[PDB]
Design a protein around this ligand. Structure first.
Ligand SMILES: [Zn+2]
Ligand SMILES: [Zn+2]
Ligand SMILES: [Zn+2]
Length: 178
């Protein structure tokens, strides 16, 4: 197995996957690494199994159909994985914890949102459709763009949104377009 966490790239107290060489901090994995389970298979492995059991699941889909799906176990897992792919980027640090807003010439968002809030919401099964999760995720970046205006710091929101959107299209097999 790897000697660093797949998500944050640090050593520490690592739980190792039994079916692939990845390792994780307990709360870096999503869901948090399960108490028992021998063998244990990481989220990457679990997602790969879904694809292998249903190869046609990789054919293209329309985003509008994906968003309306109910959060059954496989869609729950896919959203967890997509959240984890965002935390994999070090720039997610800016969006992880609860923000505050006090900048001359700007007003804070009406509905603040952050990664850890989305993480809790998934853990608590608060989303009934994929659309709930995707809307909160996109809101993170939209709030940031609006608040930071013409400051160059706005670019961090564009960057992390691009990671989110690329991974959304991959994990949910969105039909490729020009
Ligand atoms: Zn970690
Ligand atoms: Zn694995
Ligand atoms: Zn099938």
């Amino acid at each position: 197995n790897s000697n660093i966490c797949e998500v944050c790239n640090k050593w520490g107290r690592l739980f190792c996957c039994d079916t692939c060489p990845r390792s994780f901090h307990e709360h870096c994995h999503i869901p948090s690494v399960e108490a028992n389970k021998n063998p244990w298979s990481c989220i990457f492995c679990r997602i790969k199994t879904i694809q292998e059991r249903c190869p046609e699941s990789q054919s293209g889909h329309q985003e509008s159909e994906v968003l309306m799906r109910q959060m059954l176990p496989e869609e729950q897992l896919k959203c967890e994985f997509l959240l984890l792919k965002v935390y994999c980027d070090s720039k997610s640090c800016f969006f992880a914890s609860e923000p505050y807003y006090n900048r001359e010439g700007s007003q804070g968002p009406q509905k603040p949102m952050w990664l850890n809030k989305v993480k809790t919401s998934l853990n608590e099964q608060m989303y009934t459709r994929v659309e709930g999760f995707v809307q909160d995720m996109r809101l993170i970046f939209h709030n940031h763009k609006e608040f930071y205006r013409e400051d160059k710091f706005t670019r961090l929101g564009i960057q992390v949104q691009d990671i989110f959107e690329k991974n959304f299209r991959n994990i949910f097999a969105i039909q490729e377009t020009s």
